Ligand binder design. Structure first.
Ligand SMILES: CCCCCCCCO[C@@H]1O[C@H](CO)[C@@H](O)[C@H](O)[C@H]1O
Ligand SMILES: CCCCCCCCO[C@@H]1O[C@H](CO)[C@@H](O)[C@H](O)[C@H]1O
Ligand SMILES: CCCCCCCCO[C@@H]1O[C@H](CO)[C@@H](O)[C@H](O)[C@H]1O
Ligand SMILES: CCCCCCCCO[C@@H]1O[C@H](CO)[C@@H](O)[C@H](O)[C@H]1O
Ligand SMILES: CCCCCCCCO[C@@H]1O[C@H](CO)[C@@H](O)[C@H](O)[C@H]1O
Ligand SMILES: CC(C)C[C@H](N)C(=O)O
Ligand SMILES: [Cl-]
Ligand SMILES: [Cl-]
Ligand code: NA
Ligand code: NA
Length: 507
């Protein structure tokens, strides 16, 4: 099997796994929609009860499976629970990454397209005071990029440049992955992670220099970091906080497990996982949290910045921030650094959610790496056409795989690992090779607190929110549901094909 060459390269590839578009696009939206500081308290708690333990559990599962030549959950779940239903539950560990990748790479390709257009100065020209006259040209710029529907039909019509930049973006992701783990994902993380930290800090600095009649960047920092204990009783904030923690640390996407299956059997995972998790949080709450919201609060005030964040998941990042930057000297180049930052943010994360499908093809179907990467890309490139052309197809995928699915699968992999396999055998397998040991209190969090926390959460979804999504959406949502359900069917057939190759090989 292939291995991470260096300790540092493993951490940067794991941090590059986690530090992505969620740090800089999703976290600002999720924080502002939910009252700023009121969001932080459930966010910090969820990090301590959910994010940290699941990080360790997935590192253990990956490394455990990797010592037996398996990197994906269809095989690893069976290694933990010898039962066909573990193989079937394991398909989610391929389905969730592949579904999420279908829409993540596309959004990643926007930032590459926006970066190119901002670098070359092919950007809108706001008329030099009215905010709408400054924002509308950038709303119209993004809407023309992805092709937001102008009539009644739910059809997207992306620009030719967007589609070509998507092909370019895929080609960029293939070029890294086809070189492997050590000569591909690892080498690129040693380059991208410094680049990304540098850019973010500079932007944080430049945003902190913003002052207008409506406020300063400190006003956004106070809004984000001022508690509001009157919201701790809202199931929505807790749902939003735990869903963010999952998304940001790459938990429930089968990606950490696959990356961890390339860690040598003896090597530490306790300090490693903690560092990468600690890295991703600094990336959000310090860097991601200090760019979008302070800048939006700085030009518009808190209430309008909150209103901007509630308008959509991309308004703040693809419309508001460049519009804000367009009012400052060299703001076009500042936009380029912003969208170039997002491109390495997503690229280090898109290669992470595409490695599982590759690993499954190499490990379980014995495909060469070249063929495993290329077939994986072909699967993503084709499938992405559903996200590109059907309005709100992206949303449905992010909900079922990137929102519901990761919390379901996260609870699934904890029970399989830490209950069925055995809590004590799991505790042993987490701490083995540990440069440090997992604190004794976390054994009781993993066995009892975390699974009940998620169980209650998933029950609040299933009763109070999902009924609106099964009955109050446009009929076209079943087009995406049908496709992603058939995608699951296809992956199980591969699993079935992988256990039949294993019966003929042993014979
Ligand atoms: C069922 C279709 C399977 C894949 C066919 C993809 C067709 C891509 O079509 C292309 O889309 C671009 C963006 O709108 C346009 O700029 C081009 O005119 C068009 O050739
Ligand atoms: C990174 C290189 C990407 C090259 C994409 C070329 C897409 C060409 O596309 C064309 O470009 C013209 C000039 O801007 C536009 O007027 C047209 O709308 C567009 O069809
Ligand atoms: C669900 C994935 C398939 C959707 C992409 C299909 C691309 C359709 O292609 C479209 O054909 C039209 C007439 O032929 C042209 O007006 C457009 O230029 C072109 O975008
Ligand atoms: C999943 C649905 C997304 C598909 C994108 C629809 C592209 C709309 O393109 C349509 O293609 C039709 C057949 O070629 C033509 O009759 C029309 O000229 C054209 O409007
Ligand atoms: C619910 C999650 C709590 C996370 C905070 C744990 C802080 C670690 O706590 C420490 O753990 C050590 C090893 O068990 C002990 O030696 C110390 O008594 C204890 O202070
Ligand atoms: C699906 C994951 C790779 C997402 C990534 N952890 C992010 O925060 O952007
Ligand atoms: Cl364009
Ligand atoms: Cl219709
Ligand atoms: Na993240
Ligand atoms: Na990343």
């Amino acid at each position: 099997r292939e291995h991470w060459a260096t300790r540092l390269g493993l951490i940067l590839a794991m941090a590059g796994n986690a530090v992505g578009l969620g740090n800089f696009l999703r976290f600002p939206v999720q924080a502002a929609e939910n009252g700023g500081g009121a969001f932080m308290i459930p966010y910090i708690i969820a990090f301590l009860l959910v994010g940290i333990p699941l990080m360790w559990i997935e590192w253990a599962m990956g490394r455990y499976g990797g010592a037996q030549g398996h990197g994906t959950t269809p095989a690893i779940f069976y290694l933990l629970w010898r039962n066909r239903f573990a193989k079937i539950l394991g398909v989610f560990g391929l389905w969730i990454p592949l579904v999420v990748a279908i829409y993540y790479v596309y959004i990643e390709s926007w930032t590459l397209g926006f970066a190119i257009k901002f670098l070359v100065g092919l950007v809108p020209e706001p008329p030099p005071t009215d905010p709408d006259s400054i924002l509308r040209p950038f709303k119209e710029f993004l809407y023309s990029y992805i092709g937001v529907p102008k009539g009644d039909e739910p059809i997207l019509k992306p620009s030719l440049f967007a589609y070509i930049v998507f092909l370019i973006t895929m080609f960029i992701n293939v070029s890294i992955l086809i070189r492997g783990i050590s000569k591909g994902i690892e080498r690129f993380a040693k380059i991208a992670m410094p680049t990304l930290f540098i850019l973010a800090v500079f932007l944080v600095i430049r945003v902190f220099l913003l002052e207008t009649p409506n406020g300063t960047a400190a006003d956004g920092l106070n809004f984000l970091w001022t508690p509001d204990f009157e919201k701790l009783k809202d199931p929505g904030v807790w749902i939003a906080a735990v869903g963010q923690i999952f998304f940001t640390l790459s938990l429930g996407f089968g990606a950490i497990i696959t990356y961890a299956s390339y860690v040598r059997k003896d090597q530490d995972i306790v300090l490693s996982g903690l560092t990468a998790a600690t890295l991703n949080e600094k990336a959000e709450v310090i860097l991601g949290g200090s760019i979008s919201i302070p800048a939006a609060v700085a030009f518009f005030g808190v209430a309008n910045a909150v209103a901007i964040a509630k308008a959509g998941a991309f308004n703040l990042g693809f419309i508001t921030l460049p519009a804000i930057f367009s009012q400052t000297a060299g703001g076009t180049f500042l936009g380029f650094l912003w969208f170039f930052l997002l491109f390495f943010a997503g690229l280090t994360s898109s290669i992470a959610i595409m490695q599982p499908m590759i690993a499954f093809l190499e490990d379980e179907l014995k495909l060469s790496r070249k063929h495993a990467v290329l077939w994986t890309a072909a699967i993503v490139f084709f499938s992405a056409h559903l996200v590109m052309f059907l309005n709100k197809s992206l949303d449905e995928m992010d909900f079922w795989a990137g929102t519901i699915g990761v919390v379901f699968f996260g609870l699934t992999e904890l029970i399989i690992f830490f209950w069925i396999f055995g809590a004590d055998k799991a505790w042993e397998e987490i701490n083995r090779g540990g440069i440090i040991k997992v604190p004794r209190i976390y054994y009781y969090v993993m066995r009892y607190i975390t699974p009940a926390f998620l169980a209650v959460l998933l029950v609040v979804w299933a009763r109070e929110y999902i009924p609106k999504i099964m009955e109050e959406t446009h009929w076209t949502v079943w087009i995406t549901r049908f496709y992603i359900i058939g995608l699951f069917l296809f992956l199980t057939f591969l699993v079935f094909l992988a256990e039949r190759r294993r019966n003929h090989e042993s014979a």
